[PDB]
Motif scaffolding. Structure first.
Motif, short mmCIF file in Angstrom:
data_model
loop_
_atom_site.label_atom_id
_atom_site.label_comp_id
_atom_site.label_asym_id
_atom_site.label_seq_id
_atom_site.Cartn_x
_atom_site.Cartn_y
_atom_site.Cartn_z
N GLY C 1 0.83 -1.21 0.00
CA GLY C 1 0.00 0.00 0.00
C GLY C 1 0.86 1.25 0.00
O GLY C 1 2.09 1.15 -0.01
N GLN C 2 0.20 2.39 0.01
CA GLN C 2 0.83 3.73 0.07
C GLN C 2 0.22 4.47 1.26
O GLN C 2 -1.02 4.53 1.36
CB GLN C 2 0.59 4.51 -1.22
N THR C 3 1.08 4.97 2.14
CA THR C 3 0.63 5.61 3.39
C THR C 3 1.48 6.84 3.64
O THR C 3 2.72 6.74 3.60
CB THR C 3 0.75 4.63 4.56
N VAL C 4 0.81 7.95 3.96
CA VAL C 4 1.48 9.16 4.48
C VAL C 4 0.78 9.52 5.79
O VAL C 4 -0.44 9.62 5.79
CB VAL C 4 1.44 10.33 3.48
N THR C 5 1.55 9.71 6.86
CA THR C 5 0.99 10.17 8.15
C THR C 5 1.73 11.42 8.59
O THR C 5 2.98 11.48 8.50
CB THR C 5 0.99 9.07 9.21
N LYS C 6 0.96 12.39 9.06
CA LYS C 6 1.46 13.72 9.51
C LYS C 6 0.74 14.16 10.78
O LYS C 6 -0.36 13.69 11.13
CB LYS C 6 1.21 14.77 8.43
#
Lengths: 6, 6, 6, 6, 6, 6, 6, 6, 6, 6, 6, 6, 6, 6, 6, 6, 6, 6
Positions: C1-6
């Motif tokens: 998958g593709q994940t960005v967390t901020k």
């Protein structure tokens, strides 16, 4: 996989 | 997978 | 998958 | 999947 | 799936 | 599915 | 499905 | 808010 | 918020 | 926030 | 935040 | 934040 | 942050 | 931070 | 994999 | 930081 | 793998 | 930092 952590 | 955490 | 967390 | 969390 | 949380 | 939460 | 919550 | 999508 | 997508 | 995607 | 993607 | 991707 | 990618 | 990638 | 941690 | 890559 | 830690 | 790569 590809991982960047900041 | 691809992951960026900030 | 593709994940960005901020 | 594709996930963005802010 | 596709998810954006803010 | 597609989900946006704000 | 498609969901937007605000 | 609180959201569950299935 | 709290979000679960499936 | 808290997010789980599956 | 807290994020789990699967 | 806390992130797990699988 | 804390990140695990698999 | 703390990062594990597999 | 490819990993950058900062 | 602390990093393990496998 | 390829790893950079800073 | 502390780094292990395998």
């Amino acid at each position: 996989g590809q991982t960047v952590t900041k």
